[PDB]
Design a protein around this ligand. Structure first.
Ligand SMILES: Nc1ncnc2c1ncn2[C@@H]1O[C@H](COP(=O)(O)OP(=O)(O)OP(=O)(O)O)[C@@H](O)[C@H]1O
Ligand SMILES: [Mg+2]
Lengths: 393, 48, 73
């Protein structure tokens, strides 16, 4: 509560202890004196009747205007609802920490002098982007990464948990992490996990959702997205499928691609530009990364870059037992027989196989899922490969 | 608040346009000197 | 469409006022009068004459054009 900063080494030390013991001891003297005074006299009556004088000054028909410019000197220009513009005096009881242009101010009826402010809605965009807890699962449902999860934890979680480590040595955390790899490999899932596990406000956006059909709306959207992230303490932003917005930036192009490039420039400035980004982190994903712009994924914008390989032989077993976890299976399930094949299966492919097998098991009324069903489902899912066989090989 | 639009004659006589209220032809109270007011500058006027 | 001033309550016109122009229009007007003589531009000697004859000459000596019986450009 607006307490003093010790500004000793800030790391466990004897000076941090003595500057700390001192504030505690002063608070102790203050508390003792206050308790003595309260016992000696309640002062409830005196503290009261100040509310009465205030409410006397602010008449009953208080008017909700809209502040529009503070002259910096206990004066203001407050606009009444109709649209008129008055130049009123700011009184002494208004908490000035709450006065910024555009705030719904509470004016006097006969004199329009500012006498209070009101709260506003919390959903410019906060609700629509924040994801809350991930319905899928926690870190439990993710297996096989181990190293990647460790990287992300150090990049985004560890700087929140124990700042002392980074602080001790004078190095700030990395700026942003870009998750890149073949489709269906665990990018969005790991971001979801590090979101639902940490203690900041995690915001998610799709790149195609920044392609706007009015000019100068994409840049506005990105500017806002990075505007309500410093209003909210530590924050994380994850711009998924960025490829749809950040591309190689070929100049020989016509149409709305120019607007795409212009929003890309706005983002490129937000991440690392003139001003200090405050306390926010940026995660990104891209199935295809060779096509990003050099200035977006350059070192000071995205320090960490993470590859995401497919499950090889055993992570396949882990994922399979993760998705088959909740289903009654017959005692003939030759799971390895399904895994041993070097079919280059992907994680999303494993989920598809599990769901399809479960669904046909439901179709046949059978209380349990059989190995034959899983193999048939595997054949069916892989059926969505196509392409020209001899060609290219 | 009112937005001066014209300052006619050397004699002080000012056409101001109060936003969404009306448009008048008013004079200078004693506090402001004639040099302070120019065309196009927002000015404050009383309610009477 | 004229601009007149009226009493606040009797609504009786009382004086004629200068016409109203959008402030944006009025700002377009020159006040400073730049100071760059016809010596400061060299290499465009035909063009300068063309424009001066077109724009300035009619304004000063209109008698010439009236005598030739030609509307100026
Ligand atoms: N190692 C894994 N552990 C758990 N689930 C996994 C794993 N790998 C893939 N999945 C499954 O992949 C599904 C697809 O979501 P995910 O977040 O992994 O996509 P993605 O890799 O970001 O995809 P895209 O590249 O299309 O953006 C998730 O529902 C999860 O069930
Ligand atoms: Mg992915």
């Amino acid at each position: 509560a607006s307490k003093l900063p010790l500004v000793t080494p800030h790391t466990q030390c004897r000076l941090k202890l003595l500057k700390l013991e001192r504030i505690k001891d002063y608070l102790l003297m203050e508390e003792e004196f206050i308790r003595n005074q309260e016992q000696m006299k309640p002062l409830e009556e005196k503290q009261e009747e100040e509310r009465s004088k205030v409410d006397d000054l602010r008449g009953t028909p208080m008017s909700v205007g809209t502040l529009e410019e503070i002259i910096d000197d206990n004066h203001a220009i407050v606009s009444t609802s109709v649209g008129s513009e008055h130049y009123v005096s700011i009184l002494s009881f208004v908490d000035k920490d709450l006065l910024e242009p555009g705030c719904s101010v509470l004016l006097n009826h006969k004199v329009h002098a500012v006498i209070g402010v009101l709260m506003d809605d919390t959903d410019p965009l906060v609700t629509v982007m924040k994801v809350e807890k991930a319905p899928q699962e926690t870190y439990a449902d993710i297996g096989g990464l181990d190293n990647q999860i460790q990287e992300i934890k150090e990049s985004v979680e560890l700087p929140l948990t124990h700042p002392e480590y980074y602080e001790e040595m004078g190095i700030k955390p990395p700026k942003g992490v870009i998750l890149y790899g073949p489709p269906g490999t665990g990018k969005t899932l790991l971001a979801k996990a590090v979101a639902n596990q940490t203690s900041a406000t995690f915001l998610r956006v799709v790149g195609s959702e920044l392609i706007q059909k009015y000019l100068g709306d994409g840049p506005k959207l990105v500017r806002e997205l990075f505007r309500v992230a410093e209003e909210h303490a530590p924050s994380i932003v994850f711009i998924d499928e960025i490829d749809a917005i950040g591309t190689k930036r070929y100049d020989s192009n016509s149409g709305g691609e120019r607007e795409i490039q212009r929003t890309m420039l706005e983002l490129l400035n937000q991440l690392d530009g003139f001003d200090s980004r405050g306390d926010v982190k940026v995660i990104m994903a891209t199935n295809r990364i060779e096509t990003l712009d050099p200035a977006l994924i350059r070192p000071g914008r995205i320090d960490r870059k993470i590859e995401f390989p497919l499950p090889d032989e055993k992570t396949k077993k882990r994922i399979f037992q993760i998705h088959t976890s909740r289903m009654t299976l017959a005692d003939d399930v030759t799971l390895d027989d399904l895994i041993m094949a070097k079919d280059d299966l992907s994680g999303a492919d494993i989920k598809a196989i599990c769901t399809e097998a479960g669904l046909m098991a439901l179709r046949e009324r059978r209380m349990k899922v059989t190995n034959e069903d899983f193999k048939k489902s595997k054949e069916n899912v892989l059926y969505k490969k196509q392409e020209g066989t001899p060609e290219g090989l | 608040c009112t937005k001066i639009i014209n300052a006619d004659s050397e004699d002080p006589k000012y056409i101001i346009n109060v936003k969404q209220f009306a448009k008048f032809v008013v004079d200078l109270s004693d506090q402001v000197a004639p040099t302070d007011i120019e065309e196009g500058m927002r000015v404050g006027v009383d309610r009477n | 469409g004229d601009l007149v001033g009226v009493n606040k309550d009797s609504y009786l016109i009382l004086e004629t006022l200068p016409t109203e122009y959008d402030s944006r229009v009025k700002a377009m007007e020159v006040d400073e009068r730049p100071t760059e003589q016809y010596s400061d531009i060299g290499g465009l000697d035909k063009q300068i004459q063309e424009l001066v004859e077109a724009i300035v000459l009619p304004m000063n000596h209109k008698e010439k054009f009236e005598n030739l019986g030609i509307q100026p450009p």
